């Protein structure tokens, strides 16, 4: 766990997430997918304490999937993000809190608008045009301040994202073994295989 | 009649009918005999079978190296009570490094059975027990009834047709009490005692069950070809 990014463009939300899983002085895996599909048009990436991250992601996934079956209806990205925030807000005052930061990228089918939510382990939710967790933000935010426009296409968003990964690969101390990129739009969730 | 719905109810003449009905389950159960001398204490039990294809229901249970009982009535209730006795014998050993007195064993069973007769919801135990043991004050024989009443005796018997064996022991009292330092003869007297409760059936090799405890004898049970000596 370390690098998770998010960019909301005109018609989609793009999430980039690092592939490395390091423990100690060994990179144990270089092909790890740090995300779970919560519903057909909502994707959550995650980063933080080992074990906690996946346990939390899958727990949220199970609850959203349960809701979908019960009501035969997909919950809005705003609604999912609020549910996730409350779970983290409960967690922080527990005996052992979930130390997990997340990005929730979703496409609202009622509004026909992409939405990106950044939530930290304390339960601090913000809707953003672009987001990042951890040290990644210290490079990417200023870069996106400059290059980002609100009316960009998905292809323009991927080039903008490439520009971020290049900067991180140049200046970050750790080898994060590249990223898995996923796009969330009106047609659902798909993975970019060649990045 | 109207006062036998539960154990919490007294009859107009001051009777607890559920306790009396539990007492009736003992009378239906197979006969078992208890007797002792000054050196040894012996249990003799007639085991019962469902049919020729079935096994014979085990009547005697070991509680410690120096104590155990024979049952008559509901076998699962004897298991609950014998397990409680095993724990109390064991608590006495671990905490106080002390073998549990046979008298205290009886007092504990009495108090356990009593609580079931004074509370709503529960029921009385449906079994009678004959406890034998050898402790610091020599050999002992106890008779437990699920009313709570425990009684120390030289000899006794409980179960179906137990009055035959009980009369015999009442006549033989002076003889068998002085069988000291002789296990086989004390068993022989017990086997002859239980024989007075037999009708149509006789004592076979897989039918008879004997147990003994004494001065230099741990509580041991004899079944099968080991009891062929006493037929």
């Amino acid at each position: 766990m370390d690098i998770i990014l998010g960019i909301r463009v005109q018609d989609s939300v793009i999430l980039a997430s690092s592939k490395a899983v390091t423990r100690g002085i060994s990179v144990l895996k270089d092909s790890d997918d740090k995300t779970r599909q919560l519903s057909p048009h909502t994707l959550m990436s995650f980063a933080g304490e080992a074990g906690d991250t996946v346990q939390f992601a899958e727990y949220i996934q199970a609850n959203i999937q349960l809701y979908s079956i019960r009501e035969d209806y997909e919950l809005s990205p705003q609604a999912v993000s609020s549910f996730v925030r409350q779970e983290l807000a409960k967690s922080i005052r527990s005996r052992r809190p979930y130390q997990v930061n997340v990005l929730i990228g979703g496409y609202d089918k009622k509004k026909n608008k992409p939405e990106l939510y950044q939530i930290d382990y304390l339960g601090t939710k913000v809707e953003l045009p672009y987001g990042a967790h951890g040290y990644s933000g210290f490079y990417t935010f200023s870069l996106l301040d400059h290059h980002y426009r609100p009316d960009m296409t998905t292809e323009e968003g991927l080039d903008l994202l490439k520009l971020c990964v290049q900067e991180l690969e140049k200046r970050m101390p750790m080898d994060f073994k590249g990223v898995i990129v996923k796009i969330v739009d009106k047609d659902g969730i798909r993975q970019v295989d060649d990045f | 009649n109207n006062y036998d719905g539960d154990t919490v109810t007294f009859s107009p003449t001051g009777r607890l009918f559920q306790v009396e009905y539990a007492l009736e389950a003992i009378k239906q159960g197979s006969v078992t005999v208890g007797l002792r001398s000054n050196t040894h204490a012996v249990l003799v039990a007639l085991k019962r079978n469902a049919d020729e294809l079935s096994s014979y229901q085990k009547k005697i249970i070991k509680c410690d190296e120096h104590m155990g009982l024979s049952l008559a009535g509901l076998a699962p209730d004897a298991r609950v009570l014998s397990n409680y006795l095993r724990q109390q014998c064991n608590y006495s050993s671990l905490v106080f490094n002390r073998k549990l007195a046979v008298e205290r064993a009886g007092h504990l069973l009495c108090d356990k059975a009593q609580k079931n007769t004074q509370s709503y919801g529960g029921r009385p135990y449906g079994v009678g027990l004959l406890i034998i043991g050898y402790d610091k004050s020599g050999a002992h024989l106890l008779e437990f009834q699920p009313s709570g009443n425990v009684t120390e005796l030289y000899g006794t018997a409980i179960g179906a047709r137990s009055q035959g064996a009980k009369t015999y022991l009442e006549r033989t009292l002076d003889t068998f009490i002085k069988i000291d330092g002789n296990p086989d003869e004390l068993i022989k007297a017990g086997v002859e005692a239980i024989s007075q409760s037999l009708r149509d059936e006789s004592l076979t090799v897989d039918n008879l069950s004997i147990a003994i405890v004494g001065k230099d004898t741990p509580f041991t049970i004899y079944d099968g070809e080991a009891v062929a000596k006493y037929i």
């Binding site: - | 109207n2 006062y3 154990t7 919490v8 109810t9 007294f10 009859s11 107009p12 003449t13 001051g14 009777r15 607890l16 008298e103 007092h107 009495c110 108090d111 059975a113 009593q114 609580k115 007769t117 004074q118 509370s119 709503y120 919801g121 009313s147 709570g148 009443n149 009684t151 120390e152 005796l153 030289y154 000899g155 006794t156 009980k166 022991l169 009442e170 009292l173």
Partner: protein, 243 residues
């Protein structure tokens, strides 16, 4: 009606028929007595010898509470044992907190409240025992008798069981003929007589006598059983009086 089917139900009289039914179980039981004396108390009980097979001296019915209180009862023997077990807990917690051994009146109320609690609910059964008890404390000697209802009073002499009326009559004579008081050793001998006289109401099976006592002088304020020479002396005294 149906007022007698459930415990804690008042009848139209104002009576708890279940408690009165428990008294019938007490009346069915063997005779037991208590005699207050100069500096202590004496307890005695009738033990019916059902069979030759009963071991003499080894089915003890009188029970001690703490070191200074004696308890005896008539009726359902297990219920009596349950009450003593509670008594011992009540006496233990009193001594734990307040240091001094529990006073007899204090102890009498602890049983009384406990027995009375078993008349308050239908989920429990009343006690099937009347309990005679007492001992010696800082204020001297006390004798008490407690009944299934929770009712208890102090007594000069007390009796319960199948031969209670015979024993009560004999006790009333002792109170009249000894206004200045009865000694401890006398009270043991009288107790034996009164059990032997009260045995006339239960004379199919012969019986075994059991006596205990607390006395400031004779037992140093502690509860003890009467055994050996002193027991046989009391038996002989009782045998001489019946003939």
């Amino acid at each position: 009606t149906g007022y007698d089917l459930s415990n804690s139900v008042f009848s139209p009289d104002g009576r708890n028929f279940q408690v009165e039914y428990a008294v019938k179980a007490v009346e069915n039981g063997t005779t037991s007595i208590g005699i207050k004396c100069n500096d202590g108390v004496v307890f005695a009980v009738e033990k019916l010898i059902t069979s030759k097979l009963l071991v003499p001296q080894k089915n003890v019915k009188i029970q001690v509470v703490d070191r200074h209180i004696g308890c005896v009862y008539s009726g359902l023997i297990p219920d009596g044992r349950h009450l003593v077990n509670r008594g011992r807990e009540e006496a233990a917690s009193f001594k734990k907190l307040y240091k001094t051994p529990i006073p007899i009146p204090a102890f009498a109320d602890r049983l009384g409240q406990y027995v009375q609690a078993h008349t308050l609910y239908n989920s429990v059964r009343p006690f099937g025992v009347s309990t005679i008890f007492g001992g010696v404390d800082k204020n001297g000697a006390h004798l008490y008798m407690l009944e299934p209802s929770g009712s208890y009073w102090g007594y000069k002499g007390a009796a319960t069981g199948k031969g209670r009326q015979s024993a009560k009559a004999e006790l009333e004579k002792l109170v009249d003929h000894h206004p200045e008081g009865l000694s401890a050793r006398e009270a043991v001998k009288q107790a034996a007589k009164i059990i032997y006289l009260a045995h006339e109401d239960n004379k199919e099976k012969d019986f075994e006598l059991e006596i205990s006592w607390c006395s400031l002088s004779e037992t140093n304020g502690l509860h003890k059983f009467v055994k050996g020479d002193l027991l046989q002396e009391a038996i002989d005294f009782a045998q001489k009086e019946i003939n």
